[PDB]
Design a protein around this ligand. Sequence first.
Ligand SMILES: O=S(=O)(c1cccs1)N1CCN(c2ccc(C(O)(C(F)(F)F)C(F)(F)F)cc2)CC1
Ligand SMILES: O=P(O)(O)OC[C@@H](O)[C@@H](O)[C@H](O)[C@@H](O)CO
Length: 585
Amino acid sequence: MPGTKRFQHVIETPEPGKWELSGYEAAVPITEKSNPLTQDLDKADAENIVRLLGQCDAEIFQEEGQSTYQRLYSESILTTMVQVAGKVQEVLKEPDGGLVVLSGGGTSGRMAFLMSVSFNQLMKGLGQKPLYTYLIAGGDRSVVASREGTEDSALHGIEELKKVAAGKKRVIVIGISVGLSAPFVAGQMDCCMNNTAVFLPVLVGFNPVSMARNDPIEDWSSTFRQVAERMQKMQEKQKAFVLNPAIGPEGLSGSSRMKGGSATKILLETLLLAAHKTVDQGIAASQRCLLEILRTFERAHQVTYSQSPKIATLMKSVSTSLEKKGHVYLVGWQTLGIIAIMDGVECIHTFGADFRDVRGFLIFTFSQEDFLTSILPSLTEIDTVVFIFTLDDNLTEVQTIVEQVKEKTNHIQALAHSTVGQTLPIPLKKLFPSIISITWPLLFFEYEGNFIQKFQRELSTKWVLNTVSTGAHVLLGKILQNHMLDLRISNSKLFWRALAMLQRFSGQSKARCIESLLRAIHFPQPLSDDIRAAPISCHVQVAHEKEQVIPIALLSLLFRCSITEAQAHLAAAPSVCEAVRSALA
Ligand SMILES: O=S(=O)(c1cccs1)N1CCN(c2ccc(C(O)(C(F)(F)F)C(F)(F)F)cc2)CC1
Ligand SMILES: O=P(O)(O)OC[C@@H](O)[C@@H](O)[C@H](O)[C@@H](O)CO
């Protein structure tokens, strides 16, 4: 038929009660599953949400049981991290004609950037020439922008890589895709494998290779699964590597900004920090060095979620601030300001939130006597400002701003990263009665700016901000069980997530769900044969511009009615979410 081939890889909708036994669930990639821990997340109160997402993040560190998917601590994973640390070494010995690229779209690309700076600092600090760089879907503007459409081109990924790979002679390309999903990455990896004598591809994600994407990429002939299958074969001869531990599903299904983002830093900082630290020692990096690092990162989680109660509250002040239709501000210094920006940008696509609903500031990059003049005026009784900084920062730069924001705002609150027994100047910092002090042990540090202390803090902030931003919106009633139904379809992956969600909630056939989705997307145009057979980017591009696409499609299905009828029905309910919930009853 027309469209049959575009949709060929979609498994049919199981008959009720047979979701398990048709083998459908076993086909859903780990990264997209519903985490059972979060089945009733739309009901958790602020303190549970914090617990539940604390539990989900912990799974990053959970070990392998006895037939089952390998994990962060399995010896096949750590061995591979050893081998890779190793290849990063060769390059560090030959900094002339040498380069190391970290690449991904979306948050994988953000993570890539963060880590390229750090590992560039570290080499600067020893007056070694910088070898790291990053690549993000849609260039550097993407690092601080919501730009979900940019990941779909394999040729774009190959372009951006051909740029930075110059006339260099040894290139390590660490391609990052939580889902083993992004076409951007796929093309980089396939390119690398064509020119081994220069390129070393290393692929980082969190699905087994047999769950890697196998739907066709519009500008490329092989799929992600093929590329990854072939990289795995090459690993036997140490010419490619696949680093792909399971870490369990995301608390909000498919939200790979969360665990996926964290596991990415954890996995790669670990392995890179080891690479360097063991070079000047003139010793092979070993599982033992990595493990120290990993266990530090696993302490970091326990440390970080010690502050759960105060985390829950900061979430409550954010929820109400956004219920009351206010705005929310995150202000922070050095890399923690960045991480702030990042969390706020992600709320746009992740929740259909406006770019002011939760905004991030660095000292986006709006300075002391700047933020005070421009942003400060328009704050309000109902708003919330959040301060994120270490005590090794300019605390006089800090207090000024809090002195000032105590004017319009009262719901402030802060996130203070001390190394133990640093005190916190002004005991009149009962500006924040119950701050979020997170205090870090003393450690042994050789390298420059105590990089492990950076990674810990960064990671803990990400955990905090993410849990908080995600937490706020669930509380608002905006999530359905642990799914975001009402997403904006802005790339092919989200198109598939939409379709899958229509099948899950309607229980109706694949062909009906596809029909309702394409009708909803293209309304008022009807299903022509061209539209049915069009490449998925055609639907993406049109859907990207609409509102309530997925709920209208689900409604069409549940009432077994038309798009005109479901739109009118929706317009008649108090809100999207009641329309949907009601219709499920
Ligand atoms: O090819 S994909 O783009 C892909 C991306 C990454 C690796 S492969 N596509 C695979 C299937 N997929 C999905 C999503 C949700 C469900 C759900 O059934 C429900 F729709 F309900 F969300 C579940 F989460 F509940 F399990 C099922 C399947 C989304 C993405
Ligand atoms: O790392 P992947 O699977 O290639 O995902 C790449 C991006 O889609 C992903 O980071 C996305 O932008 C975030 O919205 C996830 O909440």
